[PDB]
Design a protein around this ligand. Structure first.
Ligand SMILES: [Fe+3]
Ligand SMILES: [Zn+2]
Length: 191
C-alpha cells in the first residue's frame, strides 16, 4: 500500500488534492494520514536544517511500531513486523527544511530499501521566495516531487526526460517544468 503521511503543520487543506493527484499519476491507491505531526530528528543548528536520512530511519521505526495504523487487516502481525518496509510504503510530507550530507538542501529524499520517502514543501511554497501564497502551485509541486520520491521506492532511478516525474530538478524552475507524467520508459518499469 502507499501511505501519504501529511504533517498537519503543512496546510491540511492541501492534503486531499495531493493524495488524489499522487494516486492518479502513480495509478495506485494512496491512503491519507493528515491528523498529526511527525517530529523531525537530526537537526543541524549551524545549517538550520534537518538530516533527512535520520528522519527516514525514524519513519521506518515508526511504521514498524504502528501496526494499528499501517498494517492491512488481512495481514498477519508477525509478517508485518518482518516485512512492513516491502509492503507499506510511506511518503512523509514535512514542514522542515531538508539536507543530506552531499547536498546544500533537498526538496525530498527516498530510502528504497526501507520503503520510506520524504518531501518538504519548505522550498516549494511560494512564500519561501517572498511571493504570495498559491495553493495550486504548491499542490503541483508536492505531487511532482512526491511521485518522484515514491517512484524511487519502486526501483526507478533518475530519468533524462525533463518533463518526466523521475527527472531530478536542480532548482524550483526545473521542478515546475516537470509534468504530471511518467514517460514511456518509466511507466514500463513502474509496472
Ligand atoms: Fe521517465
Ligand atoms: Zn531522486
Amino acid at each position: 500500500g502507499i501511505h501519504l503521511f501529511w504533517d498537519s503543520r503543512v496546510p491540511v487543506g492541501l492534503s486531499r488534492p495531493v493524495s488524489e493527484e499522487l494516486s492518479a499519476v502513480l495509478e495506485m491507491p494512496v491512503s491519507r494520514i493528515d491528523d498529526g505531526i511527525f517530529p523531525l530528528e537530526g537537526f543541524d543548528p549551524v545549517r538550520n536544517q534537518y538530516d533527512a536520512v535520520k528522519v527516514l530511519l525514524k519513519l521506518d521505526m515508526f511504521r514498524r511500531r504502528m501496526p494499528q495504523i499501517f498494517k492491512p487487516a488481512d495481514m498477519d502481525l508477525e509478517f508485518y513486523n518482518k516485512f512492513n518496509h516491502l509492503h507499506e510504503k510511506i511518503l512523509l510530507v514535512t514542514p522542515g527544511d531538508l539536507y543530506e550530507p552531499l547536498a546544500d538542501f533537498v526538496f525530498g529524499l527516498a530510502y528504497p530499501k526501507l520503503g520510506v520517502a520524504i518531501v518538504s514543501p519548505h522550498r516549494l511554497q511560494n512564500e519561501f521566495y517572498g511571493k504570495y501564497a498559491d495553493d495550486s502551485a504548491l499542490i503541483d509541486r508536492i505531487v511532482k516531487e512526491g511521485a518522484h520520491e515514491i517512484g524511487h521506492l519502486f526501483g526507478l532511478g533518475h530519468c533524462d526526460n525533463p518533463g518526466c516525474i523521475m527527472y531530478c530538478p536542480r532548482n524550483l524552475d526545473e521542478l515546475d517544468r516537470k509534468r504530471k507524467y511518467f514517460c514511456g520508459k518509466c511507466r514500463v518499469q513502474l509496472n
